[PDB]
């Protein structure tokens, strides 16, 4: 699955492929870009298939409903929703286009990498564990981005230690997605990523 969108402020590409033998993806995502802001979330439900999806899809729906809240408030709602489910790992990203400011919060092995034209990257270590309904302390990062910055958020089905090289070399999200194709052909796990190129 590929979905491409653009507006004045961002061009995006979402890619998803199910684990081998599965009809429903255990990963979910939500994204909405308008004239003012981006909300982007990617979640990996524990395990795969329908029961993983029960968890990640609940997160998708909460992010859609509560998109206007801050990232820490949204992620805690997601955590609470995991109480009677398998649970999930997740990342939530909000971008204010006018301020060129992003805010990011995550739990578990969903990765975010932001690459700037200054050749400096933000690629925070994943936070351990998963959203299970149990109390969490959350880490939020807030920063300005340079015009032309690019990012990826990806589930652990995508294993790319040299991701920053791909972001730096590629001149568009389409090119970067094509350069990642080699990592999608195994279907060992659900695999989801969102690429963005910011104006
Ligand atoms: Mn999973
Ligand atoms: Mn996974």
**Nearest ligand by distance to the CA of 54:** 1
The helix (run of H) or strand (run of E) holding residue 175 is helix 173-179
Q: How was this structure determined?
A: X-ray
131 alpha carbon – ligand 1 mean position (Å): 12
Which ligand neighbours the alpha carbon of 56 most closely?
1
Give distance in angstroms: CA of 32 to centre of ligand 2.
23
CB of 182 within 8 A of CB of 21? no
CATH classification at residue 167:
3.60.40.10
Quick check: helix, strand or coil at residue 91?
strand
Domain count, the chain: 1
CA 137 / ligand 1 centre spacing (Å): 22
E strands, the chain, are 2-6, 10-17, 27-33, 37-45, 88-96, 101-107, 111-115, 121-122, 140-144, 150-154, 191-198
For residue 41, report the distance from its CA to the centre of ligand 2, in Å: 15
Residues spanned by the domain of 104: 1-199
- Distances in whole angstroms, Cα of residue 13 to Cα of each of 4, 46, 61, 85, 146: 4, 24, 20, 29, 20
Cα(88) to ligand 1 centroid in Å equals: 7
Helices assigned H by DSSP within 10-162: 49-66, 71-81
Query: How many other CB atoms are there within 10 angstroms of residue 179's CB atom?
Result: 15
The residue behind tokens 């990826």 is 152
Q: Which of 2, 12, 3 is nearest to 172 (CA)?
A: 12
Spacing, Cα 68 to ligand 1 middle (Å)? 27
Nearest one of 66, 1, 5 to 34, comparing CA atoms:
5
Q: Tokens for 84?
A: 């009677």
Neighbouring C-alpha atoms within 13 Å toward the C-beta of 19: 20
Distance 13 CA to ligand 2 centre (A): 19
User: Ligand 1: distance of its center to the CA of 46 in Å?
Assistant: 4
């Amino acid at each position: 699955m590929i979905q491409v969108e653009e507006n004045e402020h961002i061009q995006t590409l979402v890619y998803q492929l199910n684990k081998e033998g599965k009809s429903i993806c255990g990963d979910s995502f939500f994204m909405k870009a308008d004239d003012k802001e981006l909300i982007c979330a990617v979640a990996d439900g524990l395990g795969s298939g329908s029961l993983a999806n029960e968890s990640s899809a609940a997160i998708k729906d909460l992010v859609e409903n509560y998109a206007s809240e801050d990232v820490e408030s949204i992620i805690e709602r997601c955590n609470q929703a995991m109480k009677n489910k398998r649970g999930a790992t997740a990342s939530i990203l909000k971008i204010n286009f006018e301020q060129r400011q992003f805010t990011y919060c995550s739990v578990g092995n969903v990765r975010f990498i932001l690459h700037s034209p200054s050749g400096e990257s933000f690629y925070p270590l994943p936070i351990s564990g998963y959203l299970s309904g149990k109390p969490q302390k959350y880490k939020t990062h807030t920063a300005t981005y340079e015009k032309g910055s690019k990012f990826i958020i990806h589930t652990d089905g995508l294993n790319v230690p040299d991701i920053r090289s791909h972001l730096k070399k590629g001149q568009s999200v389409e090119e970067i997605s094509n350069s990642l194709k080699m990592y999608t052909t195994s279907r060992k796990d659900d695999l989801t990523y969102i690429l963005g190129q910011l104006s």
